[PDB]
Amino acid sequence: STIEELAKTFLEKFNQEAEDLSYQSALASWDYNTNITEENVQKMNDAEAKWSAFYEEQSKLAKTYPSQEVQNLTVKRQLQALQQSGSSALSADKSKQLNTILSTMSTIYSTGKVCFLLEPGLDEIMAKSTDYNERLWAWEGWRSVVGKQLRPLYEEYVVLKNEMARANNYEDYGDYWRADYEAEGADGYDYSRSQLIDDVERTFSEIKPLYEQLHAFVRTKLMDAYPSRISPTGCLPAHLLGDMWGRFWTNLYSLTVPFGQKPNIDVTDTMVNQGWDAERIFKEAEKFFVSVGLPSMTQGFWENSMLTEPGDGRKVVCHPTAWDLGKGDFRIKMCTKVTMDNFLTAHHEMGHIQYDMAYATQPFLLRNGANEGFHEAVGEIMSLSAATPEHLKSIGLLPYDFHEDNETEINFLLKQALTIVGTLPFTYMLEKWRWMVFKGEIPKEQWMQKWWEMKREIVGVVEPMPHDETYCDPAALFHVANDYSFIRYYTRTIYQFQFQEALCQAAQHEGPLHKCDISNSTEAGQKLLNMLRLGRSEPWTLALENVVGAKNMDVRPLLNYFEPLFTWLKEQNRNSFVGWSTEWTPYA
Amino acid sequence: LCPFGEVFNATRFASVYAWNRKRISNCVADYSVLYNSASFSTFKCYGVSPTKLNDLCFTNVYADSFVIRGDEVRQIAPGQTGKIADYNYKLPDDFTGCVIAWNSNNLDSKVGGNYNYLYRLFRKSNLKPFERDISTEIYQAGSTPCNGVEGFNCYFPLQSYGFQPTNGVGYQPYRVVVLSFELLHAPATVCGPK
Ligand SMILES: *[C@@H]1O[C@H](CO)[C@@H](O)[C@H](O)[C@H]1NC(C)=O
Ligand SMILES: [Zn+2]
């Protein structure tokens, strides 16, 4: 009659039924994502509907066992994971309204027009064109056709979601999104949600000295791109950042390059001449993993996976993904070619499947990552290690006599920094703004004002036109129009370099960290696997402590990775001013 | 010559809980066709050497046949515990016999999914060695007695295996035959040639 025994007995039946229904749904979805017809969608819809109905009914039944009385931690975590899932229910009348609002907010984003549609043409015009007027035209037009048509919808969305958040014992919706990082366990392994808003901020205080230098180096480089249109001591204009939003600065490499007379490493021509194929890339990727102490891929992977576009007239989307269908079924789907970026993406997806295979022995409800940010941080370090000159020289794509001149490291580090460092303040600012909006710190009538004040104070980007309260700029982003979390990227960026530092120190390497390689090293593989096999059965603090040796986020490895770039940059900024002042406007 | 082909290559097998039991006596058995079959996965023999199984001989040989999953094969061994090793089929510690298992994915898998193989996952007490149970009474978990219908804290005691062709290795069907030897006071009747 003990509650723990009843919970155990209930979960024993639940696992067995779920392991079949989920597999059927996953196979039905794979059928659609592989072959696109008019009959596969019906089967996919039926399978997904049945799975959702079963999950909701079981979640409703599983709320009679209190989570406080159960003492065993594994059973308690399984019950907590089952009860909260499917608990998003307050009333049918308001649920219908919320669903309709979400659908109509999602559909307007896709079919927007300026007549140029976003994805084919606007992205290209934002990423290639070098004219002031055209870029400002596109920026203002896109923020006028979609932004001005979403303010009331989002104003209703915030209050309707806050009601649902309050009804479910949480404080607000921000507290709901921050519940993924809650950890309960031993004395030193407890992490509270309200702590995260502090920790993130602390880490950013260490990244400001680096990013600021970069903000100067880019600015003095745009001086030549446009003669007399940007300030020599103020913030950068918004539309000249390489994208529609400024999320990534990767498109500014051509203008902002230290030495343009030395081309970077390219192996596509050698790969074509040596006579490689799509399967050879995956064979080499598997050989990379078998040499560190991780299992080789299964027989069914080769027989069932799609590794090239089929020419039999079928239609495939073939966006590179890795699937874990359950019951020992692991597949990778990708349109493969004979370039280098596909070679790196192969390692990324291979790392995903290795992580999936690590915790296949855990119970059903605990077969996920420790937190939302580990699962891609595991896959990025593999590409970082497999894109190095030493690995390519070993594998034969480069001659042995080839050397690495200092300019090559400087250029490669600048290219990496324009992608990794530049995207952190944007994410931090957007997440902070939505958290404050949800909580209620910012009244309903001062949204855009505070948004641009934060943009001028944190990121350092100024608007070209005056925006009143009618407009709504944050809603233009895809991750906001369709509701999604955004702090995952900020966590992943720190985790991927902390893991890399730990593994490289364990792999007995000397010198700068960006020339590391974990090939032919079983100790690093064992250290990584000790965490990969843990799964979600333990709090993420212990999982992090099993690789690095700490309990929280540390930013020192990220700053160590960019030390040569920092030292070089400090030399070229002596005859310039570092920083910005928020009193200058392009329109006045 | 008693027909080992009657059980080894039979068209249909039995479930774990209703496992098939066969008695073999008054014949000659040539084990050289089995150990050197070169088409088996596991051939673990306990209490008797595999090569010395052609000289010393017993009176009665009992063959137990069923089908199980892939990762549950390790549970058919002396002293092991689990879910099918304590509720469905149990082996005593002092076991003198052999366990043979092999893959059968080509036969016991369907594109839609086989579902006619059953096993037990709820019981009041562990099975005594060499015992079977085929009762279909509703398992009683909570204090409230449930009669004829299963509801809260009451469940049916049998479930089915979801065998499908595109599974892994530890989820594919495996056919298992266990041979047990008896050496009672009765005179010997069965063993190999001269
Ligand atoms: C059952 O069939 C197999 C399959 O060829 C064959 O070896 C023989 O007839 C039987 N097996 C044994 C071990 O005798
Ligand atoms: Zn990935």
Numbering used by the authors:
A (entry chain A): 19 to 132, 141 to 614
B (entry chain B): 335 to 528
Question: What did the authors write?
Answer:
SARS-CoV-2 uses the receptor binding domain (RBD) of spike (S) protein to recognize its host receptor angiotensin-converting enzyme 2 (ACE2) and mediate cell entry. We measured the binding affinities of rabbit and hare angiotensin-converting enzyme 2 (ACE2) with receptor-binding domains (RBDs) from SARS-CoV, SARS-CoV-2, and its variants and found that rabbit and hare ACE2s had broad variant tropism, with significantly enhanced affinities to Omicron BA.4/5 and its subsequent-emerged sub-variants (>10 fold). To elucidate the molecular basis of rabbit ACE2 binding to SARS-CoV, SARS-CoV-2 PT and Omicron BA.4/5 S proteins, we solved the cryo-EM structures of rabbit ACE2 in complex with S proteins of SARS-CoV, SARS-CoV-2 PT, and SARS-CoV-2 Omicron BA.4/5. Q34, a unique residue of rabbit ACE2 compared to other ACE2 orthologs, plays an important role in ACE2 recognition.
